[PDB]
Amino acid sequence: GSRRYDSRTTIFSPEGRLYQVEYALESISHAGTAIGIMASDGIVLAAERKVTSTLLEQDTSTEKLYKLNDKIAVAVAGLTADAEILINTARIHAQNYLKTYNEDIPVEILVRRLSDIKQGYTQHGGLRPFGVSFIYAGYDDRYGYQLYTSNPSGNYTGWKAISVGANTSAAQTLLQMDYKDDMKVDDAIELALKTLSKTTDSSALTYDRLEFATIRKGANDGEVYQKIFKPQEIKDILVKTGIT
Amino acid sequence: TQQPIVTGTSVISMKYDNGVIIAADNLGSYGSLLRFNGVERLIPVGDNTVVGISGDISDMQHIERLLKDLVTENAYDNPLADAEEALEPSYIFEYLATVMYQRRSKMNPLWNAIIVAGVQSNGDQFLRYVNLLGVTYSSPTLATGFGAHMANPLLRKVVDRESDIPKTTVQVAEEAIVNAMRVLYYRDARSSRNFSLAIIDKNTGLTFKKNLQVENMKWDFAKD
Amino acid sequence: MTDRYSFSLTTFSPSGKLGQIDYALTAVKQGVTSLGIKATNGVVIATEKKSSSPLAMSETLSKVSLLTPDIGAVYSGMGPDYRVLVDKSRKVAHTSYKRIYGEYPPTKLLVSEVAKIMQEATQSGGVRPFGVSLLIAGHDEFNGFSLYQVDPSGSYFPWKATAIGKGSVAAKTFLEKRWNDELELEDAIHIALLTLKESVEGEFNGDTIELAIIGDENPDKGPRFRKLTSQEINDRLEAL
Amino acid sequence: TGYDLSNSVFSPDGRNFQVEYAVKAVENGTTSIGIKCNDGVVFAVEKLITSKLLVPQKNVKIQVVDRHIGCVYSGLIPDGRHLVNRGREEAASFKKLYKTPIPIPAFADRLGQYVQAHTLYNSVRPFGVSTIFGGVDKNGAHLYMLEPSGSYWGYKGAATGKGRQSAKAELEKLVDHHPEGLSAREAVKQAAKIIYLAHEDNKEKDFELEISWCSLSETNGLHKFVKGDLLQEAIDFAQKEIN
Amino acid sequence: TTIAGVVYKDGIVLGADTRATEGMVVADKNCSKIHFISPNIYCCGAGTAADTDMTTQLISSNLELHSLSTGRLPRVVTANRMLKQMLFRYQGYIGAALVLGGVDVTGPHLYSIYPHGSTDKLPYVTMGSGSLAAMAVFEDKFRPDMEEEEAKNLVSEAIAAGIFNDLGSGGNIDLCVISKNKLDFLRPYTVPNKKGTRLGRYRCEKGTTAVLTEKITPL
Amino acid sequence: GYDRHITIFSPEGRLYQVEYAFKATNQTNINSLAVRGKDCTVVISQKKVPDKLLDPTTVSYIFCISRTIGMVVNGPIPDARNAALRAKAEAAEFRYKYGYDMPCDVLAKRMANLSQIYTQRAYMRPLGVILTFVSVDEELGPSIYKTDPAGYYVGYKATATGPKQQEITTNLENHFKKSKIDHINEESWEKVVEFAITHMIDALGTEFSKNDLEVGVATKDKFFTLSAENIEERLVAIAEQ
Amino acid sequence: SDPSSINGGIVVAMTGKDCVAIACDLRLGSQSLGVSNKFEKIFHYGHVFLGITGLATDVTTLNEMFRYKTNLYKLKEERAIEPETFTQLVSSSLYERRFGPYFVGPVVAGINSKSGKPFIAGFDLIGCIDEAKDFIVSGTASDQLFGMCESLYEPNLEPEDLFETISQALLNAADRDALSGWGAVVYIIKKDEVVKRYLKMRQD
Amino acid sequence: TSIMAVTFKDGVILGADSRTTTGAYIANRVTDKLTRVHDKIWCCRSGSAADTQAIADIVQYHLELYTSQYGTPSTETAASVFKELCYENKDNLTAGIIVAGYDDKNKGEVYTIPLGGSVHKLPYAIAGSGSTFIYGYCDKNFRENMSKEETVDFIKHSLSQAIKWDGSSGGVIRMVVLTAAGVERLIFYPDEYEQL
Ligand SMILES: *[C@@H](CS(C)(=O)=O)[C@H](Cc1ccc(CN)cc1)NC(=O)[C@H](COC)NC(=O)[C@H](CC(C)C)NC(=O)c1cnc(C)s1
Ligand SMILES: [Cl-]
Ligand SMILES: [Mg+2]
Ligand SMILES: [Mg+2]
Ligand SMILES: [Mg+2]
Ligand SMILES: [Mg+2]
Structure with a gap:
């Protein structure tokens, strides 16, 4: 029968690792670097696009930074199509919670939910896992600003600063070296871009190869504002920080 | 739940010394309208059983097909289909009885009263009743609907208990049945003159008589 | 009959490659060249009608398909796969969008829905990915004119101009030189016919080329999608 | 290679080897035949008597479908029974809806x-x-014959099983020597002979002849088994022809 | 409602009034009762208005998808079948009473579709509460193979009959003329009643209403 | 090498099971040909009855799908009948739902979309057949549409299918290069059948008797197959000029 | 027993010159018993306003449901929903409960952000659209509002003229209905400012 | 509704009035109640128009698909398909259908299917509301093996009376003749049949 062709995506190796999760992480390691940095007055999301031609229409393009609700955003590393499946599931969960409790979903609850979906693909169903790692940047009135990551295993953790995708080893050292707890958003913006500028496999870091975003409470009357940076704005912040 | 539309009236029957007789008129009434004058309501199964059916005619036609289909199915992988493993009256009845009670229990009855008349392998007379409720009973005389009220009283004067069956000849029994059919024709507003009669005898086998008529009709006292 | 293939036929290999997606992309590479160019006042999509036999009526085989009145699609790769994506794209544009909102979906969302269908063939049980890349050109009121590419993976990217299939590497270089942000639709059609001539071996005329545009409304609106006639192409080939 | 390990897999030839392997099981089975006559058909089968303990005339192989169709098969006997069970369901659903008994081509x-x-x-x-x-x-x-692939055709005569080549040769003689046609009673006799001649391929063990027939004149278009005197008359005719 | 259709020499003329009522109250005096199915087929609607709207839309949507796949214009028989088989399935609970008219490859066709799933194929039909008023006009004056402007007048006259004599019907007269060479969607074709002129101005002057509190938010 | 057993991509971007289903197509060793007249569409196919025990009347690869649509199959008979039964069922369901006879091309596309499913879904194998559908469509006129195991389909002016398809195709190509029209300019279907047979004889280099051919003819509002004697009359007319 | 008139209340909407107005009473009751005088019936999703009269549990449910749907709409479309589009969304949503409907009388009001055109619409409980330019009325005093609106209304009113028209229509209609009143709210909506005013009315 | 099917020497003729009423309103006065399920198998419809139309369309489908596979179906087969639908769905249908068809083997055949879903094969059949008024007339005047002209007159006179007395019946008398020669449609207007 069919058994002959079954890859068996949900098994342990003799060492106690999940083959497909490990290989999906290998996939993700080749994806463009994404960085999240949490400051006292906001979060920064920065991410590097990949391959890019001069002919790619950048202003209408979204491969890295996605919006889940008005308080929570994600940076993607891995299969963009796989991410969009999970993103539309997360967007619904946020609205289901809003409809039920008449309050915005707390960041950790949404993250757990997605991470539980990813986990399910590793334990049952016989399907390949999602080849995606997320950085979740979000705010709620319990814990304030939060950074999380999830990966194909379904494990998630909280961070002050973090990278996913390519050259995470190098990126995480550079962040660990220059991050401080009293840091501010404008400083974190600079750190994020400096880290990508050093870890990039490209010759130089330019506006057309970047997606960029900030979650500030820095708004009038203490309300959270998500800013997905436009191509021209990424170009300005690259000049401001002195990278181009 | 339905309501019967085209209907058949009385089926009457009795045991005699060697076998059973069953009879039923050839009418399919449509309420008060005497709509169909050529409806056969005795349906033989093999050469040892006749199933007489009253009530809804569409449900009768359904039962007719179930029996026809039962004969086919019994013949399958059965080298003794025309001998030791042929269908018995008791098998045919029990099947129908099961069906009738199952259907009433799903609140969707076959809207009929049935009399299965036949002779068994060992020569025994089989005569048993079943209806839309799955109610079953046997008696030396059986009749459905109207015949229960008028035919049974006349037929019971011939065979009043079990011990009268061996004393009753086929001629006496057939006369009684044909007499009862006349009485029903006078008095049942939903009956007809034309009927069918079937004798299932352990010696002479199945004799099926079509296009019989009620005769010797006393009307002369009307003129006064 | 039990559809016993309830497990993925696309899985991660030790290197992190999804084999079947890569192989689907190889099938797209072997397919005939198609391209798209976005102008200021329109978008053009074009491809070669590679006729399997001269007895075949190539007019019956439409490589360029209308998805909505304002959105058109062309492909490179396996034709039968394209055909069933067009069927599903047309339908989803009604069920999940028109019957709800009373209007057709914007280009990006219809693209996203198609991308979703392709992604599901890349992860669902008992299926191979689609062996096509699509180029979807369209217009909507709030986004204006747009051009998207959709790959077997389900990944999609918006383009100013691009090409896929056989001579895509050479065609993309050609387009990079010719494209600017002040092209009119006629200029983009002119460039499309030039770019497409490079990858075509044999006959190069209106009968062997399929070319459509998303442009002005052709007379509630008129449809912006318009497939150019065999005659209309030949006219522009004299000014080539 | 590996194309023969799974059913429904096309080999590089364009063949389904699993089906062709099923044919080997058929070829391994006993000889069964069919003869189309003037107003009907005749079916006959070789039943190998493995032992003296087999009850004669009891292990019946030919199966009736509806009341007018006869089926006989060679190979895995349970598979044949499974197919006839299905055939009976098909013939029943056809008659239920369309009233008429199922036509043979249908x-x-x-x-x-x-x-x-x-x-x-x-x-x-x-x-x-x-x-x-x-x-x-x-x-x-x-008269029809239906193979493991799903292939079937109409036949003047048909044969399958271990003695099929022997039988086919005999059937071909009858087709040539009787263009005007064969009678039902003739076809019964000829069926007996052909099973007896085709028994040379299974000659180690002795056998039991079983014949059935549908004929418009002889059986009123119904399937019946050839029994008693008519069966013995056919056996005698067959025994005479081998000697 | 008063909706009608006629088959004339070159094609189909559909007609409808414009009054939408809740009970005895008029909610819309100029509502569209003539619906688009396909470019060559239209549908006048009576009965329960929601059912009328969403049945025509659903069948219009499915016919659009059908027509994209076949690449040829849809037929009136297929519109008729799709409406019919749906309405029948729902056993009259979808209270859509349609006049379906259009022009095929096979010529002009006119149908009346009823809520229970019966359809009549006819040269002239009327539906709604004003069907008897409208049908009187057709029985009085209809003849087969009419010229266009004549058929337009007959349908308009039949809708008018409904407007005036039926209380459920009112407002303007909409027509839809369908032939092989054109589609004319005339809304409104006629305005048989002028809007009643008011003699006074009853609008209040600023500051007349008593306010408790106010809030202004910009966008 | 399980990428050759089921319908998944090989490293070259190829579906080997689809390609091997195409090879099953010629397993019958039968050549078919289809041409269009003015008022008609004619389909001819070789008929080979190798066994004398076969009833030759039951040996057919032409199918009457609807009254208007005929279908000839190049491939094994079990898959041919699989396809025939489905096409009949689809054509009947179509008429019921949409109230007009299923067009030839719409059926062809429908059967092609079904064929496509077997190339994408792993549990289903492709059918090893090429389906040539013919009709005189009430909108498009004489129509020839062909489907294969890949799920590809296309309309034809004329076509040929089988082991010697290339020879027949080129023979037909050359005739239409001369006449410079998409059809056989002939009033009667009888003469269009005569053309079809004649151009198969020339292309294959073999003479035919009445029992070596099988002919299907589509006219307006019916498709029908010719009897042996109808073909014999056709062969007599060919020989006499 | 009649679900549409257990809780009571009303909504009215009007168009003016480069503006729309939508207004509602504040009552929630259990038939004769007044329960809340802070039950607002007008909600908004971006710049599109939705009044809902009828059974209060359904008013609440639909508000929560359209918030949900318009939120996902905005995330996917990357723009706020327009009145014309939302109207179709309401119609669809209501009709998908055709044989178990929400006992409501919704009213859409807003200005199309691109065209600048003032828009209003109303629906029956199963989603048939009343698409009138002048005014849309709903609730237990709908008849009263129809009469008030037909005599008071005229086209192309300036925002503060329109305020007086809609307010007097609401107030005087509500005072002839036992199940309406207990306060009122009027939104004056312009292309880029919205004025919300609470009205002083008799509290019986 | 007044409908009837009558077998005669050369085959069978179906007959019907043309009136369809909604209460006392004549919704359609030119109704075609003789509907074709196959080339030479037609039916007369009485009862719910929605139901008899729905059934007739399903039968037409079944016989089309039968024909695709097994060639021309018998008139009996058509009646069996009608019956199966009517009987199995008796609780949700109001259909009184007469089925009439011409084989070459069997010649003319008439089957009537009343409300119950029972089948009755008859030399002729009458049905619909107007049939009650002509049981007496039809029984007295019907003969077997009539000529075409005699059977046309028998149906014309019968339905003329059915129309005269039944308010639910009226309009034109349509007929459909089924013989070896083919299918012939006849129509007879009030001015012709009322003066009989
Ligand atoms: C006339 C139909 S009639 C009285 O049967 O002749 C119109 C037809 C019509 C068609 C299309 C449109 C626009 N899409 C509007 C009107 N129908 C109506 O006026 C119907 C009532 O006909 C019986 N009215 C409704 O359906 C109204 C809703 C509109 C006023 C928006 N619904 C109600 O009043 C309801 C009350 N309770 C319900 C449940 S529906
Ligand atoms: Cl399809
Ligand atoms: Mg497969
Ligand atoms: Mg009050
Ligand atoms: Mg009070
Ligand atoms: Mg009358």
Whole structure:
């Protein structure tokens, strides 16, 4: 029968690792670097696009930074199509919670939910896992600003600063070296871009190869504002920080 | 739940010394309208059983097909289909009885009263009743609907208990049945003159008589 | 009959490659060249009608398909796969969008829905990915004119101009030189016919080329999608 | 290679080896035949007497479908029974809806489509039987033969099993020597002979002859088994012809 | 409602009034009762208005998808079948009473579709509460193979009959003329009643209403 | 090498099971040909009855799908009948749902979309057949549409299918290069059948008797197959000029 | 027993010159018993306003449901929903409960952000659209509002003229209905400012 | 509704009035109640128009698909398909259908299917509301093996009376003749049949 062709995506190796999760992480390691940095007055999301031609229409393009609700955003590393499946599931969960409790979903609850979906693909169903790692940047009135990551295993953790995708080893050292707890958003913006500028496999870091975003409470009357940076704005912040 | 539309009236029957007789008129009434004058309501199964059916005619036609289909199915992988493993009256009845009670229990009855008349392998007379409720009973005389009220009283004067069956000849029994059919024709507003009669005898086998008529009709006292 | 293939036929290999997606992309590479160019006042999509036999009526085989009145699609790769994506794209544009909102979906969302269908063939049980890349050109009121590419993976990217299939590497270089942000639709059609001539071996005329545009409304609106006639192409080939 | 390990897999030839392996099971089975006559069909089968403990005339192989169709097969006997059970369901549903008993060509395709369905998936095995069947319908007599692939055709004569080549040669003589046609009683006699001649391929063990027939004149278009005197008359005719 | 259709020489003329009522109250005096199915087929609607709207839309949507796949214009028989078989399935609970008119490859066709799933194929039909008023006009004056402007007048006259004599019907007269060479969607074709002129101005002057509190938010 | 057993991509971007289903197509060793007249569409196919025990009347690869649509199959008979039964069922369901006879091309596309499913879904194998559909469509006129195991389909002016398809195709190509029209400019179907047979004889280099051919003819509002004697009359007319 | 008139209350909407107005009473009751005088019936999703009269549990449910749907709409479309589009969304949503409907009388009001065109619409409980330019009325005093609106209304009113028209229509209609009143709210909506005013009315 | 099917020497003729009423309103006065399920198998419809139309369309489908596979179906087969639908769905249908068809083997055949879903094969059949008024007339005047002209007159006179007395019946008398020669449609207007 069919058994002959079954890859068996949900098994342990003799060492106690999940083959497909490990290989999906290998996939993700080749994806463009994404960085999240949490400051006292906001979060920064920065991410590097990949391959890019001069002919790619950048202003209408979204491969890295996605919006889940008005308080929570994600940076993607891995299969963009796989991410969009999970993103539309997360967007619904946020609205289901809003409809039920008449309050915005707390960041950790949404993250757990997605991470539980990813986990399910590793334990049952016989399907390949999602080849995606997320950085979740979000705010709620319990814990304030939060950074999380999830990966194909379904494990998630909280961070002050973090990278996913390519050259995470190098990126995480550079962040660990220059991050401080009293840091501010404008400083974190600079750190994020400096880290990508050093870890990039490209010759130089330019506006057309970047997606960029900030979650500030820095708004009038203490309300959270998500800013997905436009191509021209990424170009300005690259000049401001002195990278181009 | 339905309501019967085209209907058949009385089926009457009795045991005699060697076998059973069953009879039923050839009418399919449509309420008060005497709509169909050529409806056969005795349906033989093999050469040892006749199933007489009253009530809804569409449900009768359904039962007719179930029996026809039962004969086919019994013949399958059965080298003794025309001998030791042929269908018995008791098998045919029990099947129908099961069906009738199952259907009433799903609140969707076959809207009929049935009399299965036949002779068994060992020569025994089989005569048993079943209806839309799955109610079953046997008696030396059986009749459905109207015949229960008028035919049974006349037929019971011939065979009043079990011990009268061996004393009753086929001629006496057939006369009684044909007499009862006349009485029903006078008095049942939903009956007809034309009927069918079937004798299932352990010696002479199945004799099926079509296009019989009620005769010797006393009307002369009307003129006064 | 039990559809016993309830497990993925696309899985991660030790290197992190999804084999079947890569192989689907190889099938797209072997397919005939198609391209798209976005102008200021329109978008053009074009491809070669590679006729399997001269007895075949190539007019019956439409490589360029209308998805909505304002959105058109062309492909490179396996034709039968394209055909069933067009069927599903047309339908989803009604069920999940028109019957709800009373209007057709914007280009990006219809693209996203198609991308979703392709992604599901890349992860669902008992299926191979689609062996096509699509180029979807369209217009909507709030986004204006747009051009998207959709790959077997389900990944999609918006383009100013691009090409896929056989001579895509050479065609993309050609387009990079010719494209600017002040092209009119006629200029983009002119460039499309030039770019497409490079990858075509044999006959190069209106009968062997399929070319459509998303442009002005052709007379509630008129449809912006318009497939150019065999005659209309030949006219522009004299000014080539 | 590996193309023969799974059903419904095309080899590089364009063949389904699992089906061709099912044919080997058929070829391994006992000889069964079918003879189309003037107003009907005759079916006969070789039943190998493995032991003296087998009860004579009891282990019946030929099966009736509806009241007018006869089926006989060679190969895996249970597979044949499974196919006839299905055929009976098909013939029953046809009659239920359309009133008339199922026509033989109609019935043939019902078996044909079902056997073919078992070559479409790896989760099922093909049928290990060639089935010879037929009967009399409103358009007259029909004889068919149906292979593990789902292939079937109409036949003047048919044969399958271990003695098929022997039988086929004999059937071909009858077709040549009787262009005007064969009578039902003649076909019974000839069927007996052909099973007796085809028994040389299974000559180690002795056998039991079983014949059935549908004929418009002789059986009123119904399937009946050849029994008693008519069976003995056919056995005598067959025994005379081998000697 | 008063909706009608006629088959004339070159094609189909559909007609409808414009009054939408809740009970005895008029909610819309100028509502569209003539619906688009396909470019060559239209549908006048009576009965329960929601059912009328969403049945025509659903069948219009499915016919659009059908027509994209076949690449040829849809037929009136297929519109008729799709409406019919749906309405029948729902056993009259979808209270859509349609006049379906259009022009095929096979010529002009006109149908009346009822809520229970019966359809009549006819040269002239009327539906709604004003069907008897409208049908009187057709029985009085209809003849087969009329010229266009004549058929337009007959349908308009039949809708008018409904407007005035039926209380459920009112407002303007909409027509839809369908032939092989054109589609004319005339809304409104006629305005048989002028809007009643008011003699006074009853609008209040600023500051007349008593306010408790106010809030202004910009966008 | 399980990428050759089921319908998944090989490293070259190829579906080997689809390609091997195409090879099963010629397993019958039968050549078919289809041409269009003015008022008609004619389909001819070789008929080979190798066994004398076969009833030659039951040996057919032409199918009457609807009254208007005929279908000839190049491939094994079990898959041919699989396809025939489905096409009949689809054509009947179509008429019921949409109230007009299923067009030839719409059926062809429908059967092609079904064929496509077997190339994408792993549990289903492709059918090893090429389906040539013919009709005189009430909108498009004489129509020839062909489907294969890949799920590809296309309309034809004329076509040929089988082991010697290339020879027949080029023979037909050359005739239409001369006449410079998409059809056989002939009033009667009888003469269009005569053309079809004649151009198969020339292309294959073989003479035919009445029992070596099988002919299907589509006219407006019916498709029908010719009897042996109808073909014999056709062969007599060919020989006499 | 009649679900549409257990809780009571009303909504009215009007168009003016480069503006729309939508207004509602504040009552929630259990038939004769007044329960809340802070039950607002007008909600908004971006710049599109939705009044809902009828059974209060359904008013609440639909508000929560359209918030949900318009939120996902905005995330996917990357723009706020327009009145014309939302109207179709309401119609669809209501009709998908055709044979178990929400006992409501919704009213859409807003200005199309691109065209600048003032828009209003109303629906029956199963989603048939009343698409009138002048005014849309709903609730237990709908008849009263129809009469008030037909005599008071005229086209192309300036925002503060329109305020007086809609307010007097609401107030005087509500005072002839036992199940309406207990306060009122009027939104004056312009292309880029919205004025919300609470009205002083008799509290019986 | 007044409908009837009558077998005669050369085959069978179906007959019907043309009136369809909604209460006392004549919704359609030119109704075609003789509907074709196959080339030479037609039916007369009485009862719910929605139901008899729905049934007739399903039968037409079944016989089309039968024909695709097994060639021309018998008139009996058509009646069996009608019956199966009517009987199995008796609780949700109001259909009184007469089925009439011409084989070459069997010649003319008439089957009537009343409300119950029972089948009755008859030399002729009458049905619909107007049939009650002509049981007496039809029984007295019907003969077997009539000529075409005699059977046309028998149906014309019968339905003329059915129309005269039944308010639910009226309009034109349509007929459909089924013989070896083919299918012939006849129509007879009030001015012709009322003066009989
Ligand atoms: C006339 C139909 S009649 C009285 O049967 O002749 C119109 C037809 C019509 C068609 C299309 C449109 C616009 N899409 C509007 C009107 N129908 C109506 O006026 C119907 C009532 O006909 C019986 N009215 C409704 O359906 C109204 C809703 C509109 C006023 C928006 N619904 C109600 O009043 C309801 C009350 N309770 C319900 C449940 S529906
Ligand atoms: Cl399809
Ligand atoms: Mg497969
Ligand atoms: Mg009050
Ligand atoms: Mg009070
Ligand atoms: Mg009358």
